[PDB]
Design a protein around this ligand. Structure first.
Ligand SMILES: CC(C)(C)[C@@H]1NC(=O)O[C@@H]2CCC[C@H]2OC/C=C/C(F)(F)c2nc3ccccc3nc2O[C@@H]2C[C@@H](C(=O)N[C@]3(C(=O)NS(=O)(=O)C4(C)CC4)C[C@H]3C(F)F)N(C2)C1=O
Ligand SMILES: [Zn+2]
Length: 200
């Protein structure tokens, strides 16, 4: 509009949970409910303890994932836009933004753990979803991989920003898009970890 004094400000991305991969079982944990998420988005002040590599994140209108690799919390631009992330000291500005790669990054929150970029050159990958499903994916190109067991896109919705990992648990990529036939996701496209390492 033309009245700057009443123009609104978009809130921060807020960590609302995590995918726990510490033990023998992968499972999602929620760490903040909808009400606290809304307040934290407006203030940008998040005093909750952060743990793990894969965070569940939310805005006022979307929920997706964010993954720490080499001390950067990475996610997709189509989820985060240019938004700050909430942190204990106030909103934190993105350190990386690349709409051409559908990629953004913030400094990894204190308490998080980072994945190591994969150097194995392995093509047997594993996609981790927001429901803590571990989905075998065969790498088919620099940025594409096929699901060994296709499933409706509904099962992958909300998992952009999640990791594809190698057999050793290294980060190979950041889940970006699905490739579907009749609503069934047969393959995925991801931001390769090398494209991250270049951005850095
Ligand atoms: C048909 C389809 C499956 C919906 C779509 N496929 C598709 O486009 O495939 C083509 C063919 C192979 C590569 C790809 O080239 C196009 C590149 C798209 C892009 F990624 F570069 C992208 N750049 C943007 C930049 C600025 C603003 C918006 C942008 N929007 C984009 O893509 C958009 C969004 C992305 C998305 O849905 N991601 C996921 C997800 O969970 N999101 S999310 O968490 O729910 C949520 C929306 C909250 C954040 C993983 C897939 C889940 F559902 F499985 N899209 C559309 C798709 O996957
Ligand atoms: Zn590896």
């Amino acid at each position: 509009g033309s009245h700057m004094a009443s123009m609104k400000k978009k809130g921060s991305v807020v960590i609302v949970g995590r995918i726990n991969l510490s033990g023998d079982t992968a499972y999602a944990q929620q760490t903040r409910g909808e009400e606290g998420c809304q307040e934290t988005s407006q203030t940008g002040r998040d005093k909750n303890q952060v743990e793990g590599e894969v965070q569940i994140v939310s805005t006022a209108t979307q929920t997706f994932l964010a993954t720490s690799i080499n001390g950067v919390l990475w996610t997709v631009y189509h989820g985060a836009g240019t938004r700050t992330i909430a942190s204990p000291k106030g909103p934190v500005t993105q350190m990386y933004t690349n709409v051409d790669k559908d990629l953004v990054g913030w400094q990894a929150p204190q308490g998080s753990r980072s994945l190591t970029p994969c150097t194995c050159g392995s093509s047997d990958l594993y996609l981790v979803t927001r429901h803590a499903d571990v989905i075998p994916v065969r790498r088919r190109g620099d940025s594409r991989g096929s699901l060994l067991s296709p499933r409706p896109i509904s099962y992958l919705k909300g998992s952009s920003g999640g990791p594809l990992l190698c057999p050793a648990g290294h980060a190979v990529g950041i889940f970006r898009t699905a490739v579907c036939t009749r609503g069934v996701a047969k393959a995925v496209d991801f931001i390769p970890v090398e494209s991250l390492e270049t951005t850095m």
